[PDB]
Amino acid sequence: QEEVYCFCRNVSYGPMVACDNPACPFEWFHYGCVGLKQAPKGKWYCSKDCKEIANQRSKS
């Protein structure tokens, strides 16, 4: 099945993850869309922001 997800505006290639952030515009993003592999041993954030969004206003 072909469904768009990450801001990439393209379909889910295969390697993906879901935004583990209270917000995260979506809840499915591709690795080719973002940056990672099999997602770190634990949890990944839909996007470089999806994570920062979970931190909620942080100097980091």
Binding site: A18, Y31, A39, K43
Partner: peptide
């Protein structure tokens, strides 16, 4: 996080 993967080309 809920993930769905299939390796990368």
């Amino acid at each position: 996080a809920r993930t769905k993967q299939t390796a990368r080309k």
